[PDB]
Structure 1
Amino acid sequence: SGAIYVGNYRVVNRHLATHNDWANLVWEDSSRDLLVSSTTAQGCDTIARCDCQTGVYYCSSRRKHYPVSFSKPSLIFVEASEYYPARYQSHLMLAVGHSEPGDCGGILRCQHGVVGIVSTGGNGLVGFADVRDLLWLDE
């Protein structure tokens, strides 16, 4: 679990969004596994606006933050799960690292701020849904 809180927006994995997130929907994209809902109070996370490919992510299944190198956002095949059929997920970045399904939502950060959240894994990898192209999160 986990979210990004920037301005009056809450960014979560779409597959973990609540019925209340859908009522307060701003934007969602199944192909990116992202959902943004509106909030009453202002959030304090800063979104990174950069092309960093190294950062640190939070792994709840280890209670540990790990430094990682990660690929640029791409269209990657993701195996079927209880949340989606087998499909390509877009704006996805992969790294070598530990992840379990409950780790989705953990933040990936660089020196500029929040880059994205954990969204995929399997086979000794961890994948992150990029949010750096969502410029409207800032206004």
Structure 2
Amino acid sequence: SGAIYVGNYRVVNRHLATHNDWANLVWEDSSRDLLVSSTTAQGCDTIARCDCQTGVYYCSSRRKHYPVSFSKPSLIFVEASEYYPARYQSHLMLAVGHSEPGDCGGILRCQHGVVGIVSTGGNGLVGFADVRDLLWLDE
């Protein structure tokens, strides 16, 4: 589990979205596994606007933050799950690091702010759905 709270927005994994996220849907993209919904309370998370390839992520399954090097946002093929058939997921960044199903939602951060959230994993690799290109989250 895990979300990003910026302004009047809540960003979550699309596969983890609630009935309330869908009833107040702003934008959603299956190819990215992202869903943004509106909120009444104001969010204080800062989104990074950068091209960093190093950061720190929160790993729920170990209650630890881990430093990682991560690839640039791209189309990476993701194995079939109870949420999606086997497809290419776009805007995905990979890193060598631990992840278990249940770790989706954990935030990835650099010195500039919030980079993205855990979205894929397995084989000792972890995937992060990037949010830095979503310039509208700040307006």
Residue matched to 2:83: 83
Identify unmatched segments of 5+ residues in structure 1.
none
Distance in 2 (CA, whole Å) between partners of 1:61 and 1:83 is: 20
What corresponds to 1:121 in structure 2?
Answer: 121
Q: CA deviation at 1:88?
A: 0.3
Aligned to 2:133, the other structure's residue is in SS state coil
- CA deviation map 1:81-108 (0-9, x unaligned): 1111000000000000000010000000
1:40-80 Cα shifts (integer Å, max 9, x gaps): 01000000000000000000000000000000000000000
Partner of 2:103: 103
Moved over 2 A (4+): none
TM-score, scaled to structure 2? 1.00
1:12-57 CA-partner distances (Å, limit 9, x unpaired): 0000000110000000000000000000010000000000000000
Unaligned stretches of 5+ in structure 2?
A: none
Structure 1 counterpart of 2:57:
57
Identity %: 100
> What is the alpha-carbon distance in structure 2 between the residues aligned to residue 41 and residue 126 of structure 1?
31
- Give the CA RMSD over aligned residues: 0.3
Is 1:39 aligned to 2:39, yes or no? Answer: yes
**For residues 7 and 42 of structure 1, what CA distance do their matches in structure 2 show?**
5
TM superposition score normalised by structure 1? 1.00
Equivalent pairs counted in the alignment come to: 139
The DSSP-based 3-state class of the residue aligned with 1:38 is strand
